[PDB]
Design a protein around this ligand. Structure first.
Ligand SMILES: *[C@@H]1O[C@H](CO)[C@@H](O)[C@H](O)[C@H]1NC(C)=O
Ligand SMILES: *[C@@H]1O[C@H](CO)[C@@H](O)[C@H](O)[C@H]1NC(C)=O
Lengths: 438, 52, 438
């Protein structure tokens, strides 16, 4: 048997509901989202880190000439010189006064610490949500994990739950996103091949142990002047550590709606937005006959005290009569009230108490007891302390938020003004076309 | 059997692959019957077999 | 400097242009795409193939009773029986009568030959393009490949080419697409976890050597009806094989714009759409100043014959008088006419013969030598053969596609239809004003 229900997507707080069938006894149903994991479909683009300028030893041709070819290493840079005369520890490394050349080449590759200290750039899109549930109906629990597209079923021991689509969809990420050591930032990096020297992304690689390392980092050589042999150079600042200086805050403390953001599959797990509709195929063996349940008459509430907070502060009592004992469900049929007991023990002629919560200063809601409507009015008051540490249960609804005193003063004033202009208009028209006779 | 199938090429091209052979490209060029250079009983023939 | 030019995206056919600096001789520039690959962003969901219905050996407890447990393997199924009495080749394998209960069992996994003909199912987002250029300027040929997004510099031997973003944005690949054995079908498969008994997506797993296989293939059991021991099972037909019979045509004979589909990175290489707005940074070494290139003193064009078609039908003739024996870049400055030859050796006096190909019946285009311009003008005849095996070199553009005598015979009619009514109106107002003196 189907039962359409649109539960709110906030984890931890349950959602009271009754299912009902003709000739059967009604029975409780509560649906809590114990966990949820919003994972996107992502695409790896490139691994970058801090580079390492290697400079091979310079090539000197004694009394001749040289020229550089073209290579394919990461930011290869060569330019020849002339008129050198280099010295080692034992001097005079050539044998003609300033008629020879030296070579000067330089390139980069990865560091021996980038296997821990790299930064995996990604590209995310179209996140698709998952929900772990906890269904319990008629003192029998069940644990289910399902997808929240409107097709994929969730089955666990003769109980089938299909979750509808999301109300409003978002993911807390942008299109381009980067990662290092679990800290998911939110950056718009230059893509593969478009390197600028001095920002994030001047080293590109497929994997970190690959060979197609492409890079530009403004390495320009200089002419040596001193008689000892070395090669001088100059190079821009490593853009990876320049990003690392002022990266900003990570998105584990910037994401809206309050959710833990895992890294290793890149979850966005366990935050709360919108409502998700489900529909539960309850097996009919878990029902009871209406010729078995305790039928009751003489139902009437009596309110002890009311307080509109986010805890179970409002108390409430009932009076009943019955003909046999057992259990019967309890439920409030409003959107501004919840109970906290879903089953109670009923005796022959006794009377029990309950507890409720509300977000409305005018508590006018209909409780139920074992399938029997009974209206009971209450009046509430604002709370004592005004910061607690457990989330609210009920939204504001805009019309139960105003009390009956506010409405009767307001609409009495409007009715006075409207009745005044209507009585003026009718006296005007009827007295005009009564006096105008001749 | 031993058949024959008409088709219709365009300005941009048409390729057809007979079995395991390589695909062959075919383009058409504007060859309307007539001449766009005089005697106006006939200009409206060349500009009608293309764009009627 | 850098010279912007929008080369069209048709592979093979070059687009000639010449550049001009003050004080320097003009320099030709040929641009042609030779091969262009279209690669999307790939997200893998699962792998399906033909299943293999395994039935483990039937557990029989003599003189007892059974009940199952739970597992996690694919399509796990329990159905205990009642009052069985099996038979091996030795008769009466069991002893205790009328209450023996056997345990049947059934589940599924992949076929052993699944490694070759499995059907990977993918998901495609927002493809990117990579073109292979070929640039020839001033007898210096340069090969390069570049990305089409407008910030990626494709550099090759002192020549920086920044191809800007393409106009049209699409791909033959829609959102959901399967792949088997190189053939790229196109299909809207069920999303992960959502099985269907008898269709594609019947058995899903993230890798072929995995153990988290899921399945829903509608295995209903039967009570054993013959005295011997077996397990009477029935199962629906495979969704993969019946999908394979009704698969439809692949993408290689349905993809528009002439795209050839390579499967191994899932590319759509070598097809033609839009224009590619690029810009070429010419180095300052291929420029001799205008005092050294031999200037031409006068030119006068005269054409010989036309056939406007795909191939080089029209022939050209310039008659010049020059200064020395150097070179001259040759370019026609139209958009409906393109020349075969790009440069020609010059004499102090002499003739020349060129070749052009156009698509309009009047050849009123302008031909430039080294420094001067000379308008060519004649009428051109339609081609004779209806089908030629090479594509057109310039476009149709529908302004000069209409002939000259057609405009000279229709615009006279429209001008007369306007002239008669404007003469009628002016003589109307003149006659009414001249009689209007009273
Ligand atoms: C569970 O509910 C059934 C009827 O819904 C009731 O008979 C039974 O007593 C309940 N279990 C306990 C432990 O009270
Ligand atoms: C190649 O180009 C240079 C520069 O314009 C020119 O001087 C030379 O003659 C050209 N080569 C030939 C074979 O014409």
């Amino acid at each position: 048997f189907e039962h359409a229900t649109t539960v709110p997507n906030v984890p931890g707080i349950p959602y009271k509901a009754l299912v009902e069938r003709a000739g059967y006894a009604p029975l409780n149903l509560e649906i809590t989202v114990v966990s949820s994991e919003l994972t996107p479909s992502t695409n790896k683009e490139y691994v970058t880190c801090k580079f390492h300028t290697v400079i091979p030893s310079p090539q000197v041709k004694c009394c001749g000439s040289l020229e550089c070819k073209a290579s394919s290493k990461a930011d290869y840079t060569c330019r020849v010189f002339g008129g050198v005369y280099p010295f080692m520890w034992g001097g005079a490394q050539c044998f003609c006064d300033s008629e020879n050349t030296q070579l000067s080449e330089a390139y980069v590759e990865f560091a021996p610490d980038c296997t821990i200290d790299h930064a995996v750039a990604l590209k995310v899109h179209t996140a698709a949500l998952k929900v772990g549930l906890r269904i319990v109906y008629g003192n029998t629990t069940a644990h289910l994990d399902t997808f929240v597209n409107g097709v994929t079923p969730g089955s666990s021991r003769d109980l089938k739950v299909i979750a509808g689509p999301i109300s409003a969809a978002f993911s807390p990420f942008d299109h381009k996103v980067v990662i290092r050591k679990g800290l998911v930032y939110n950056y718009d990096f230059p893509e593969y091949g478009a390197m600028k020297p001095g920002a994030f992304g001047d080293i590109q690689a497929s994997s970190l142990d690959a060979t197609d390392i492409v890079a530009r980092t403004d390495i320009r050589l200089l002419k040596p002047s001193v008689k000892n042999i070395h090669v001088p150079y100059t190079q821009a600042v490593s853009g990876y550590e320049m990003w690392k200086n002022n990266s900003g805050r990570p998105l584990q403390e910037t994401a809206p709606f309050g959710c833990k953001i895992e890294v290793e599959p890149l979850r966005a797990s366990n935050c709360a937005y919108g409502h998700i509709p489900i529909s539960i195929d309850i097996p009919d063996a878990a029902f009871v006959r209406s010729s078995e349940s305790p039928t009751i008459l003489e139902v009437s509430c009596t309110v002890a005290d009311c307080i509109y907070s986010a805890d179970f502060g409002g108390s409430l009592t009932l009076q009943y009569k019955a003909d046999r004992e057992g259990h019967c469900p309890v439920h409030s049929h409003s959107t501004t009230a919840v109970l906290k007991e879903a089953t109670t023990h009923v005796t022959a002629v006794g009377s029990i108490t309950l507890h409720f919560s509300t977000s409305s200063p005018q508590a006018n809601f209909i409780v139920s007891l074992c399938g029997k409507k009974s209206t009971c009015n209450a009046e509430c008051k604002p709370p004592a302390d005004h910061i607690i540490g457990e989330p609210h249960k009920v939204d504001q609804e805009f019309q139960a938020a105003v009390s009956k005193t506010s409405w009767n003063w307001l609409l009495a004033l409007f009715g006075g003004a409207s009745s005044l202009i209507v009585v003026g208009l009718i006296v005007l028209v009827c007295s005009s076309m009564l006096i105008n006779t001749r | 059997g031993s058949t024959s199938r008409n088709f219709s090429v365009g300005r941009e091209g048409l390729e057809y692959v007979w079995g395991n052979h390589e695909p062959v490209r075919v383009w058409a060029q504007e060859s309307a019957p007539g001449d766009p250079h005089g005697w106006p009983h006939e200009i409206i023939i060349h500009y009608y077999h293309r764009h009627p």
